[PDB]
Amino acid sequence: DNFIYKAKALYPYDADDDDAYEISFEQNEILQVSDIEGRWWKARRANGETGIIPSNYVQLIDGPEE
């Protein structure tokens, strides 16, 4: 449903240019995430960047929130 969560990156990730729906992030960066039922999650960075992320690279730290 509508829930958003907060995740902390355990490691950096560099998205490929070839798969242009992924986003990169830094180790210890806090991300807002949703659609966490599967392996690739929807993320938003503080800078407004939006895309999908590998869920094994992050840890859930807060949520759910409406």
């Binding site: 490691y11 950096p12 990730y13 690739w40 690279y57």
Partner: peptide, 9 residues
């Protein structure tokens, strides 16, 4: 799509 391997620990 498979998940990437975790980096070096």
């Amino acid at each position: 799509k498979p998940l990437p391997p975790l980096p070096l620990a």
